[PDB]
Design a protein around this ligand. Structure first.
Ligand code: 2MV
Length: 255
């Protein structure tokens, strides 16, 4: 019974714009990573919280990585059809509230189920759960984060669907502090309708089965991950001298 209306001219343009935006802001060779402060991995087979906090050995590198990624996400967002129709104030609210979520989403591209790592090149830029603990985070974030990465991987999203999901994540009307919720909702609805239409006419079975609902659930998962990251960042920031291991951008977004 289900009808399959064709993608409109505008919806095709929206998809093209978002793919272009992503290609301009996501380097799939990770060739800039050598510019970050170097990764350091202390001997911590026992997973000692005291040692992890004393050294924070992976923090400078991972802070630089996240800071770089926030810059790329700002660039991506500015290319989302309609985003620049929002007031500057709403733009900043949306960016600061979604940054960590979009980072988790976009990182799925480097994540591999081969060995459950984010593989961004050689030994040095292969990131494991043990690197996250070396940046001062705990299992309560790490466990659901890995589960999220695998769940997302198993959806086998088209790149078209991946970029739409990132856009929908950013343009969310229910974020605290937004002023024009109605306009944000209108922009999101345009993107949501594009995604729904794409899945129903371009995604082959059986991977398309209830796919939109699964993608919506992943957005809810990201909210939970956002909250847990914020909680853990707060405690991490109590460590004397932590600020110098971060960046001004990271300090603003998460502080
Ligand atoms: C950040 C990106 C990449 C990997 C992402 C990773 C791999 C390393 C660990 C990351 C950055 C995790 C996402 C969240 C996770 C995190 C929980 C975020 C946390 C950041 C701090 C500031 C310490 O709280 C440290 O670990 C690599 C690549 O896919 C992109 C550049 C992408 O934007």
């Amino acid at each position: 019974d289900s009808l399959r209306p064709k993608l409109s001219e505008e919806q095709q343009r929206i998809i093209a714009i978002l793919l272009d935006a992503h290609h301009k802001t996501y380097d799939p060779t990770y060739s800039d990573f050598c510019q970050f402060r170097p990764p350091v991995r202390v001997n911590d087979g026992g997973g000692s919280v005291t040692l992890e906090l004393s050294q924070l050995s992976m923090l400078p590198h991972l802070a630089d990585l996240v800071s770089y990624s926030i810059q790329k996400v700002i660039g991506f967002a500015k290319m989302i059809p309609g985003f620049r129709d929002l007031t500057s104030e709403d733009q900043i609210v949306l960016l600061k509230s979604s940054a960590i979520e979009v980072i988790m989403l976009r990182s799925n591209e480097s994540f591999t189920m081969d060995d459950m790592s984010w593989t961004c090149g050689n030994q040095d830029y292969k990131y494991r759960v043990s690197d996250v603990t070396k940046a001062g985070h705990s299992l309560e974030l790490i466990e659901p984060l890995i589960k999220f990465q695998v769940g997302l991987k198993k959806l086998n999203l088209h790149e078209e669907e991946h970029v739409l999901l990132m856009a929908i994540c950013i343009v969310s009307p229910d974020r605290p502090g937004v002023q024009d919720a109605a306009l944000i909702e209108a922009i999101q609805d345009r993107l949501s309708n594009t995604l729904q239409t794409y899945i129903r006419c371009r995604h082959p079975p059986p991977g398309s089965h209830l796919l939109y609902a699964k993608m919506i659930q992943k957005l809810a998962d990201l909210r939970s991950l956002n909250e847990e990251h914020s909680k853990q960042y707060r405690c991490l920031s109590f460590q004397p001298e932590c600020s110098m291991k971060l960046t001004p951008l990271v300090l603003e977004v998460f502080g």
